[PDB]
């Protein structure tokens, strides 16, 4: 058994972390007080769920998680929430004032003053791991903390934990729910600085989640709570292999090995189905073929783009619920004859499939209906480069006038880091072109 | 289209389906950059305070 | 009201569409780089499809289908026809063609050529590439070696295609021609064939002897308007419209344009566009597409119709700009952005 | 995240007093500092503007400054006069005679250390000081000259804190003295350098609104100040109640100010009131963008919006809010610069202001504000080319060169705006 430490940075990272651990407790049968009746080894053990939960002699199951925000209002929710009893003070880290949506303020000005405290709290969790796998890092692209402090943390983690793997869950900025106008700056700066320190990053575009919530959950004006409970479902299906018995993606390394043949191109596209409104009492239950087919609908992707006009490097199907291999292969055979699914010439045209018999868990009283089977597809397609191109274009429009740049320089950042970061994204865009275009 | 590496456990199973075959900065360097940015902030504040003293 | 941007100032068709839209009082034009548009009249090259459909609250429509180049590039069309099961290894309406680079068919081509030589059948082929415009870069040869030599002397991928040695010749004049059909595909992937086509005719008589003279063989409007005398003696601008051509087919061949030719044209349009529909449909996309296509057809002396190429950014006949451009507004634009009989034939599928 | 409020001079104290009356009403605070509200949202961010004293009393974090006692005696006698901390009244006796030099260099110089003592005392009581807001006019002597002196001294002691002002611009239509253009031009230079955000409240616009829209034949400063307190409540709503957007002063400045000098905002409000009919979301959106609803006498159709913040208050369809905001951008698609993507941000607060079931406040960073500075610059030059009324200032130790420099800097500011009004992508 090898442990995984989750790190949640900034408002988005913290609030999504809160939703994920709520869902983990529902999935593993852990009550809000940390007790787990089904766990017969009191105060210890090396079960699959122990990869995410440690144990006290009193029988409490404690998340292997650290929460970090530069202002205390979001993390205080954790402290006074339903699952407050789960964590202890050492795991919650709040500062006095935030990065004001300013990458440079989160990375340089405030990051320098808090990084050693964060590492020390991380070191304490690591010291309880007999075989630490690595870290899962949740954060937004657009916030000053999520962008600026994360990138500093990732650099220091590569130093303090050279051999360990690091995975990201990153919230890509969407104007429909976005606060700041400088988020394209923060996104590019943090991607540039974090690129060589991340083994595999799952981008979630708030635009896509927002649209899924409006279209499938019939929520007129989705809130962060709506968005985060849907995101937590996707995160859960992605980390389930680390927390349950299985043979696919049982180690953080397996994510890189199965999804990332080229280190820089480490942003798999996630697609999830089915998303069904809980307000609908009766809903026709979708088959293996139908939910699998839905993995090739852009409307169900975590980032809106057209995989028909890209190339696949790797493709994983993660099913939860009443699924058997026979149905998966029958569905795949049909979908291949009907869909545009072109792999790069130097990769096998195939799918790694994992099935977990326990159906998805849904928060009681939430917006998602209980389904008998669901699937999350992780596909590394060049089509996700469309999301880099959009971001890079917004960056270019503002930077050509140096709009807002004085805010970053005023925190000690040099103007050259902008163009340096932008040139990195240009190379990234060219890497995707060279891999997926004829 | 063949299936391979079928692993079964009580909680589920996993396998692979093949349709067609194919054809870091140091700690000192980080502290350097952080202190460089802090010094640039200090220089700019010193200019402000000098301007205000004038 | 509705908003649109113009990013191909060189489009005769959409310059008129834009002009029509403004004259409606319900459309406003914005600067080329304003993202808050409802309609993009995009550029022919590098159209930024990946930036469409991400403006909150805007239904966005573009006048090109991403991926339609597969049909409108000479090399890609050959590859698409030979590999698409829907079009099969062999479909009877496209001339035997091969892609030759200076995934290469330089060998299978010579095989069929040698076979024809041994059969002493018509063994005339025409090499061409979508890199040459204005009749530049074509070579009609009876000898295969002359064809390949001409290819290697260039740097563009080329296709070699059997030359229709027995074309249908209009009379008087013993004159070759081709048919241009305009097809509009809307955001729902309805296929609308404009009721008015045009024949682009050769002014000089067809000479099956020497192919050196690239005039009586190439029916392109520019080659006739500059390289051939008597340009315009038979009809204005070497362009015959369907009423006259239909009347001719009746008088000369006791048949109609619909029966002898248009059935095959409609079949070929359907087959091509239905083939690529899974790959380019915007039915479940965050933005929608329509596109106007120019299909080019040959007719042989047996009244069999052959597809020659598909143009993705076609121009229009001067007499037909108004009607067709108005049709674009009604069928493709106003259908998505409503205001306050039919010139198209809907090809059901 | 505490804000420290400062009000200086006659205008600054009369407008500031009304501001505290209005928001004290919204947060449920009575004239004696006792809370008698009915919703927890009133108190969640009460600390931003109020200190808590024993007995669960709430004391405005407000400092009242003037060089004569008259107006501050009125405040202390006014409706909520007893709610202010008595130590926070700091005043002289000489007055400043509508003279920027007296406020900034002579009379004001003598009093400023006492003001900074009180400011330091409020700051020291803040768990995490967010910054300062100053209410003042630019046309007089104390608010203009001493107000900008205070901002400079505050910037010196608290260089890393945000400085925001509500600055009342003079107009010949609502004028006390001919020297107002001198005082305002001298002050604008200070503001260009030493504030992060300045709400430009134009007494010309306020008069026009009272006259043309509110149908007040003879507007008084009381009538104009009703518009200002309503506007100040609107623009501080996102600071005073739970919210995601422009939550604190620094995040707001980051989203509103693309270039450091261009931080002068045109505020707007709807509905304009001085009526029982419900106002629909479309009406709110159309009005708040209408030039007639702007508090600075500038036509937004004459320039372009760099950034816009819009705050909707009341219970309303947030879907309709997004729908109308996205709509109006298309009706004015050309008046938003295209090189700042998504530069219009919208916030909603369920608490409506007193007497309205819903309302909308508009905050625009528009290049059209250059019209306001051009107006001031012309009035300044008409007198300065003849050195008229200068002796009032040279008599206080000032030299003509200082006027020449202030005028140059404001013309630079105008040409800065014009530069970005012509800029395209
Ligand atoms: N999906 C989702 N997105 C969020 C959430 N909270 C914030 N965001 C998004 O994150 C971006 C803003 O970054 P934040 O995480 O709020 O900022 P921060 O990391 O706390 O850093 P600061 O600037 O110091 O506040 C915007 O694009 C928001 O839409 C959340 O709970 N769920
Ligand atoms: N296989 C063939 N057999 C007989 N004639 C042919 C032929 N291929 C081409 N032609 C003749 O050559 C002319 C030009 O060929 P092609 O269509 O490749 O050029 P092009 O791409 O310029 C057409 P357009 O002017 O519409 O763009 C055609 O109009 C036709 O008359
Ligand atoms: N809106 C408004 N403007 C005022 C008020 N009092 C004065 N003014 C304006 O402020 C300027 C006069 O400055 P004032 O504040 O009275 O002088 P000070 O005491 O030295 O700061 C002129 O432009 C007046 O029109 C007021 O109560 N409301
Ligand atoms: Ca145990
Ligand atoms: Ca590493
Ligand atoms: Ca004295
Ligand atoms: Ca002192
Ligand atoms: Mg935050
Ligand atoms: Mg062509
Ligand atoms: Mg006065």
JSON list of C-alpha atoms in Angstrom, two decimals, chain A residues 3-154:
[
{"chain": "A", "resi": 3, "resn": "UNK", "atom": "CA", "xyz": [-0.20, 6.67, 0.17]},
{"chain": "A", "resi": 4, "resn": "UNK", "atom": "CA", "xyz": [-1.39, 9.70, -1.83]},
{"chain": "A", "resi": 5, "resn": "UNK", "atom": "CA", "xyz": [-1.43, 13.21, -0.35]},
{"chain": "A", "resi": 6, "resn": "UNK", "atom": "CA", "xyz": [-4.02, 15.65, -1.72]},
{"chain": "A", "resi": 7, "resn": "UNK", "atom": "CA", "xyz": [-3.23, 19.38, -1.72]},
{"chain": "A", "resi": 8, "resn": "UNK", "atom": "CA", "xyz": [-5.93, 22.02, -2.24]},
{"chain": "A", "resi": 9, "resn": "UNK", "atom": "CA", "xyz": [-4.84, 25.56, -3.08]},
{"chain": "A", "resi": 10, "resn": "UNK", "atom": "CA", "xyz": [-6.99, 28.68, -3.24]},
{"chain": "A", "resi": 11, "resn": "UNK", "atom": "CA", "xyz": [-10.77, 29.02, -3.22]},
{"chain": "A", "resi": 12, "resn": "UNK", "atom": "CA", "xyz": [-11.46, 26.71, -6.16]},
{"chain": "A", "resi": 13, "resn": "UNK", "atom": "CA", "xyz": [-9.00, 24.07, -4.95]},
{"chain": "A", "resi": 14, "resn": "UNK", "atom": "CA", "xyz": [-10.38, 24.18, -1.40]},
{"chain": "A", "resi": 15, "resn": "UNK", "atom": "CA", "xyz": [-14.07, 24.11, -2.30]},
{"chain": "A", "resi": 16, "resn": "UNK", "atom": "CA", "xyz": [-13.57, 21.29, -4.80]},
{"chain": "A", "resi": 17, "resn": "UNK", "atom": "CA", "xyz": [-11.49, 19.46, -2.20]},
{"chain": "A", "resi": 18, "resn": "UNK", "atom": "CA", "xyz": [-14.35, 19.83, 0.26]},
{"chain": "A", "resi": 19, "resn": "UNK", "atom": "CA", "xyz": [-16.75, 18.29, -2.27]},
{"chain": "A", "resi": 20, "resn": "UNK", "atom": "CA", "xyz": [-14.40, 15.41, -3.13]},
{"chain": "A", "resi": 21, "resn": "UNK", "atom": "CA", "xyz": [-13.75, 14.30, 0.46]},
{"chain": "A", "resi": 22, "resn": "UNK", "atom": "CA", "xyz": [-17.47, 14.50, 1.20]},
{"chain": "A", "resi": 23, "resn": "UNK", "atom": "CA", "xyz": [-17.96, 12.10, -1.71]},
{"chain": "A", "resi": 24, "resn": "UNK", "atom": "CA", "xyz": [-15.06, 9.85, -0.65]},
{"chain": "A", "resi": 25, "resn": "UNK", "atom": "CA", "xyz": [-16.66, 9.47, 2.79]},
{"chain": "A", "resi": 26, "resn": "UNK", "atom": "CA", "xyz": [-19.97, 8.51, 1.19]},
{"chain": "A", "resi": 27, "resn": "UNK", "atom": "CA", "xyz": [-18.20, 6.04, -1.09]},
{"chain": "A", "resi": 28, "resn": "UNK", "atom": "CA", "xyz": [-16.07, 4.42, 1.63]},
{"chain": "A", "resi": 29, "resn": "UNK", "atom": "CA", "xyz": [-18.72, 4.44, 4.37]},
{"chain": "A", "resi": 30, "resn": "UNK", "atom": "CA", "xyz": [-16.93, 7.01, 6.55]},
{"chain": "A", "resi": 31, "resn": "UNK", "atom": "CA", "xyz": [-19.21, 9.14, 8.73]},
{"chain": "A", "resi": 32, "resn": "UNK", "atom": "CA", "xyz": [-18.63, 12.87, 9.29]},
{"chain": "A", "resi": 33, "resn": "UNK", "atom": "CA", "xyz": [-16.99, 12.08, 12.65]},
{"chain": "A", "resi": 34, "resn": "UNK", "atom": "CA", "xyz": [-14.31, 9.98, 10.92]},
{"chain": "A", "resi": 35, "resn": "UNK", "atom": "CA", "xyz": [-15.69, 6.63, 12.11]},
{"chain": "A", "resi": 36, "resn": "UNK", "atom": "CA", "xyz": [-15.88, 3.78, 9.59]},
{"chain": "A", "resi": 37, "resn": "UNK", "atom": "CA", "xyz": [-17.95, 0.86, 10.89]},
{"chain": "A", "resi": 38, "resn": "UNK", "atom": "CA", "xyz": [-16.90, -1.51, 8.09]},
{"chain": "A", "resi": 39, "resn": "UNK", "atom": "CA", "xyz": [-13.18, -1.07, 8.86]},
{"chain": "A", "resi": 40, "resn": "UNK", "atom": "CA", "xyz": [-12.45, -4.04, 11.11]},
{"chain": "A", "resi": 41, "resn": "UNK", "atom": "CA", "xyz": [-8.73, -3.21, 11.59]},
{"chain": "A", "resi": 42, "resn": "UNK", "atom": "CA", "xyz": [-9.00, -0.47, 14.21]},
{"chain": "A", "resi": 43, "resn": "UNK", "atom": "CA", "xyz": [-6.28, 2.17, 14.18]},
{"chain": "A", "resi": 44, "resn": "UNK", "atom": "CA", "xyz": [-4.35, 0.77, 11.23]},
{"chain": "A", "resi": 45, "resn": "UNK", "atom": "CA", "xyz": [-4.22, -1.29, 8.08]},
{"chain": "A", "resi": 46, "resn": "UNK", "atom": "CA", "xyz": [-3.01, -1.17, 4.47]},
{"chain": "A", "resi": 47, "resn": "UNK", "atom": "CA", "xyz": [-6.33, -1.38, 2.63]},
{"chain": "A", "resi": 48, "resn": "UNK", "atom": "CA", "xyz": [-6.94, 0.40, -0.66]},
{"chain": "A", "resi": 49, "resn": "UNK", "atom": "CA", "xyz": [-8.84, 3.25, 1.01]},
{"chain": "A", "resi": 50, "resn": "UNK", "atom": "CA", "xyz": [-5.82, 3.78, 3.29]},
{"chain": "A", "resi": 51, "resn": "UNK", "atom": "CA", "xyz": [-4.12, 5.37, 0.27]},
{"chain": "A", "resi": 52, "resn": "UNK", "atom": "CA", "xyz": [-6.25, 8.45, 1.03]},
{"chain": "A", "resi": 53, "resn": "UNK", "atom": "CA", "xyz": [-7.12, 7.98, 4.74]},
{"chain": "A", "resi": 54, "resn": "UNK", "atom": "CA", "xyz": [-4.87, 7.44, 7.73]},
{"chain": "A", "resi": 55, "resn": "UNK", "atom": "CA", "xyz": [-6.15, 6.05, 11.03]},
{"chain": "A", "resi": 56, "resn": "UNK", "atom": "CA", "xyz": [-5.90, 7.07, 14.66]},
{"chain": "A", "resi": 57, "resn": "UNK", "atom": "CA", "xyz": [-5.96, 4.61, 17.53]},
{"chain": "A", "resi": 58, "resn": "UNK", "atom": "CA", "xyz": [-9.48, 5.91, 18.24]},
{"chain": "A", "resi": 59, "resn": "UNK", "atom": "CA", "xyz": [-10.76, 4.63, 14.89]},
{"chain": "A", "resi": 60, "resn": "UNK", "atom": "CA", "xyz": [-10.98, 7.96, 13.06]},
{"chain": "A", "resi": 61, "resn": "UNK", "atom": "CA", "xyz": [-10.14, 7.93, 9.35]},
{"chain": "A", "resi": 62, "resn": "UNK", "atom": "CA", "xyz": [-8.34, 11.18, 8.52]},
{"chain": "A", "resi": 63, "resn": "UNK", "atom": "CA", "xyz": [-7.88, 12.45, 4.94]},
{"chain": "A", "resi": 64, "resn": "UNK", "atom": "CA", "xyz": [-4.29, 12.66, 3.74]},
{"chain": "A", "resi": 65, "resn": "UNK", "atom": "CA", "xyz": [-4.98, 16.21, 2.68]},
{"chain": "A", "resi": 66, "resn": "UNK", "atom": "CA", "xyz": [-3.69, 19.74, 3.18]},
{"chain": "A", "resi": 67, "resn": "UNK", "atom": "CA", "xyz": [-5.82, 22.83, 2.49]},
{"chain": "A", "resi": 68, "resn": "UNK", "atom": "CA", "xyz": [-4.05, 26.10, 1.66]},
{"chain": "A", "resi": 69, "resn": "UNK", "atom": "CA", "xyz": [-5.60, 29.52, 1.06]},
{"chain": "A", "resi": 70, "resn": "UNK", "atom": "CA", "xyz": [-4.15, 32.99, 1.51]},
{"chain": "A", "resi": 71, "resn": "UNK", "atom": "CA", "xyz": [-7.37, 34.25, 3.10]},
{"chain": "A", "resi": 72, "resn": "UNK", "atom": "CA", "xyz": [-9.40, 32.36, 5.70]},
{"chain": "A", "resi": 73, "resn": "UNK", "atom": "CA", "xyz": [-13.05, 32.64, 4.66]},
{"chain": "A", "resi": 74, "resn": "UNK", "atom": "CA", "xyz": [-13.16, 29.54, 2.46]},
{"chain": "A", "resi": 75, "resn": "UNK", "atom": "CA", "xyz": [-11.11, 27.29, 4.74]},
{"chain": "A", "resi": 76, "resn": "UNK", "atom": "CA", "xyz": [-13.17, 28.36, 7.76]},
{"chain": "A", "resi": 77, "resn": "UNK", "atom": "CA", "xyz": [-16.11, 26.70, 5.99]},
{"chain": "A", "resi": 78, "resn": "UNK", "atom": "CA", "xyz": [-14.15, 23.44, 6.17]},
{"chain": "A", "resi": 79, "resn": "UNK", "atom": "CA", "xyz": [-13.48, 24.07, 9.87]},
{"chain": "A", "resi": 80, "resn": "UNK", "atom": "CA", "xyz": [-17.19, 24.55, 10.61]},
{"chain": "A", "resi": 81, "resn": "UNK", "atom": "CA", "xyz": [-18.73, 22.24, 7.99]},
{"chain": "A", "resi": 82, "resn": "UNK", "atom": "CA", "xyz": [-20.38, 18.85, 8.10]},
{"chain": "A", "resi": 83, "resn": "UNK", "atom": "CA", "xyz": [-17.00, 17.09, 7.93]},
{"chain": "A", "resi": 84, "resn": "UNK", "atom": "CA", "xyz": [-15.21, 19.47, 10.29]},
{"chain": "A", "resi": 85, "resn": "UNK", "atom": "CA", "xyz": [-14.50, 16.56, 12.64]},
{"chain": "A", "resi": 86, "resn": "UNK", "atom": "CA", "xyz": [-12.54, 14.84, 9.85]},
{"chain": "A", "resi": 87, "resn": "UNK", "atom": "CA", "xyz": [-9.52, 17.17, 9.76]},
{"chain": "A", "resi": 88, "resn": "UNK", "atom": "CA", "xyz": [-7.29, 18.65, 12.44]},
{"chain": "A", "resi": 89, "resn": "UNK", "atom": "CA", "xyz": [-5.89, 22.21, 12.59]},
{"chain": "A", "resi": 90, "resn": "UNK", "atom": "CA", "xyz": [-2.46, 21.28, 11.21]},
{"chain": "A", "resi": 91, "resn": "UNK", "atom": "CA", "xyz": [-4.12, 20.37, 7.90]},
{"chain": "A", "resi": 92, "resn": "UNK", "atom": "CA", "xyz": [-5.79, 23.76, 7.36]},
{"chain": "A", "resi": 93, "resn": "UNK", "atom": "CA", "xyz": [-3.53, 26.68, 6.42]},
{"chain": "A", "resi": 94, "resn": "UNK", "atom": "CA", "xyz": [-4.90, 30.22, 5.97]},
{"chain": "A", "resi": 95, "resn": "UNK", "atom": "CA", "xyz": [-3.16, 33.55, 5.45]},
{"chain": "A", "resi": 96, "resn": "UNK", "atom": "CA", "xyz": [-4.25, 37.08, 6.24]},
{"chain": "A", "resi": 97, "resn": "UNK", "atom": "CA", "xyz": [-4.86, 38.57, 2.78]},
{"chain": "A", "resi": 98, "resn": "UNK", "atom": "CA", "xyz": [-5.12, 36.94, -0.63]},
{"chain": "A", "resi": 99, "resn": "UNK", "atom": "CA", "xyz": [-3.22, 37.27, -3.93]},
{"chain": "A", "resi": 100, "resn": "UNK", "atom": "CA", "xyz": [-5.89, 39.65, -5.34]},
{"chain": "A", "resi": 101, "resn": "UNK", "atom": "CA", "xyz": [-6.14, 37.60, -8.55]},
{"chain": "A", "resi": 102, "resn": "UNK", "atom": "CA", "xyz": [-2.47, 38.45, -9.16]},
{"chain": "A", "resi": 103, "resn": "UNK", "atom": "CA", "xyz": [-0.13, 35.56, -10.07]},
{"chain": "A", "resi": 104, "resn": "UNK", "atom": "CA", "xyz": [2.92, 37.58, -9.04]},
{"chain": "A", "resi": 105, "resn": "UNK", "atom": "CA", "xyz": [1.41, 38.34, -5.64]},
{"chain": "A", "resi": 106, "resn": "UNK", "atom": "CA", "xyz": [0.67, 34.66, -5.01]},
{"chain": "A", "resi": 107, "resn": "UNK", "atom": "CA", "xyz": [3.98, 33.37, -6.34]},
{"chain": "A", "resi": 108, "resn": "UNK", "atom": "CA", "xyz": [6.52, 35.95, -5.18]},
{"chain": "A", "resi": 109, "resn": "UNK", "atom": "CA", "xyz": [5.15, 38.37, -2.59]},
{"chain": "A", "resi": 110, "resn": "UNK", "atom": "CA", "xyz": [2.99, 36.10, -0.43]},
{"chain": "A", "resi": 111, "resn": "UNK", "atom": "CA", "xyz": [4.31, 32.71, -1.57]},
{"chain": "A", "resi": 112, "resn": "UNK", "atom": "CA", "xyz": [7.80, 33.47, -0.24]},
{"chain": "A", "resi": 113, "resn": "UNK", "atom": "CA", "xyz": [6.36, 34.08, 3.23]},
{"chain": "A", "resi": 114, "resn": "UNK", "atom": "CA", "xyz": [4.20, 30.95, 3.52]},
{"chain": "A", "resi": 115, "resn": "UNK", "atom": "CA", "xyz": [5.86, 28.27, 1.36]},
{"chain": "A", "resi": 116, "resn": "UNK", "atom": "CA", "xyz": [8.04, 26.88, 4.16]},
{"chain": "A", "resi": 117, "resn": "UNK", "atom": "CA", "xyz": [5.01, 26.61, 6.45]},
{"chain": "A", "resi": 118, "resn": "UNK", "atom": "CA", "xyz": [3.06, 24.69, 3.78]},
{"chain": "A", "resi": 119, "resn": "UNK", "atom": "CA", "xyz": [5.96, 22.31, 3.12]},
{"chain": "A", "resi": 120, "resn": "UNK", "atom": "CA", "xyz": [6.30, 21.66, 6.85]},
{"chain": "A", "resi": 121, "resn": "UNK", "atom": "CA", "xyz": [2.63, 20.70, 7.10]},
{"chain": "A", "resi": 122, "resn": "UNK", "atom": "CA", "xyz": [3.11, 18.51, 4.02]},
{"chain": "A", "resi": 123, "resn": "UNK", "atom": "CA", "xyz": [6.23, 16.95, 5.53]},
{"chain": "A", "resi": 124, "resn": "UNK", "atom": "CA", "xyz": [4.19, 15.92, 8.57]},
{"chain": "A", "resi": 125, "resn": "UNK", "atom": "CA", "xyz": [1.70, 13.97, 6.44]},
{"chain": "A", "resi": 126, "resn": "UNK", "atom": "CA", "xyz": [4.53, 12.43, 4.41]},
{"chain": "A", "resi": 127, "resn": "UNK", "atom": "CA", "xyz": [6.24, 11.28, 7.63]},
{"chain": "A", "resi": 128, "resn": "UNK", "atom": "CA", "xyz": [3.16, 9.09, 8.23]},
{"chain": "A", "resi": 129, "resn": "UNK", "atom": "CA", "xyz": [3.50, 7.38, 4.83]},
{"chain": "A", "resi": 130, "resn": "UNK", "atom": "CA", "xyz": [5.38, 4.09, 4.57]},
{"chain": "A", "resi": 131, "resn": "UNK", "atom": "CA", "xyz": [5.49, 4.46, 0.77]},
{"chain": "A", "resi": 132, "resn": "UNK", "atom": "CA", "xyz": [4.34, 7.85, -0.50]},
{"chain": "A", "resi": 133, "resn": "UNK", "atom": "CA", "xyz": [3.28, 7.74, -4.15]},
{"chain": "A", "resi": 134, "resn": "UNK", "atom": "CA", "xyz": [3.01, 11.47, -4.67]},
{"chain": "A", "resi": 135, "resn": "UNK", "atom": "CA", "xyz": [0.55, 14.33, -4.66]},
{"chain": "A", "resi": 136, "resn": "UNK", "atom": "CA", "xyz": [-2.75, 15.37, -6.20]},
{"chain": "A", "resi": 137, "resn": "UNK", "atom": "CA", "xyz": [-2.91, 19.16, -6.49]},
{"chain": "A", "resi": 138, "resn": "UNK", "atom": "CA", "xyz": [-6.24, 20.98, -6.89]},
{"chain": "A", "resi": 139, "resn": "UNK", "atom": "CA", "xyz": [-6.35, 24.65, -7.89]},
{"chain": "A", "resi": 140, "resn": "UNK", "atom": "CA", "xyz": [-7.71, 27.19, -10.36]},
{"chain": "A", "resi": 141, "resn": "UNK", "atom": "CA", "xyz": [-5.78, 28.75, -13.24]},
{"chain": "A", "resi": 142, "resn": "UNK", "atom": "CA", "xyz": [-7.27, 32.21, -12.76]},
{"chain": "A", "resi": 143, "resn": "UNK", "atom": "CA", "xyz": [-6.91, 32.99, -9.06]},
{"chain": "A", "resi": 144, "resn": "UNK", "atom": "CA", "xyz": [-3.81, 34.66, -7.68]},
{"chain": "A", "resi": 145, "resn": "UNK", "atom": "CA", "xyz": [-3.31, 31.85, -5.17]},
{"chain": "A", "resi": 146, "resn": "UNK", "atom": "CA", "xyz": [-4.38, 28.93, -7.35]},
{"chain": "A", "resi": 147, "resn": "UNK", "atom": "CA", "xyz": [-2.05, 30.08, -10.12]},
{"chain": "A", "resi": 148, "resn": "UNK", "atom": "CA", "xyz": [0.86, 31.76, -8.35]},
{"chain": "A", "resi": 149, "resn": "UNK", "atom": "CA", "xyz": [1.27, 29.82, -5.12]},
{"chain": "A", "resi": 150, "resn": "UNK", "atom": "CA", "xyz": [0.59, 26.45, -6.78]},
{"chain": "A", "resi": 151, "resn": "UNK", "atom": "CA", "xyz": [3.45, 26.92, -9.23]},
{"chain": "A", "resi": 152, "resn": "UNK", "atom": "CA", "xyz": [5.82, 27.77, -6.37]},
{"chain": "A", "resi": 153, "resn": "UNK", "atom": "CA", "xyz": [4.63, 24.73, -4.42]},
{"chain": "A", "resi": 154, "resn": "UNK", "atom": "CA", "xyz": [5.10, 22.43, -7.42]}
]
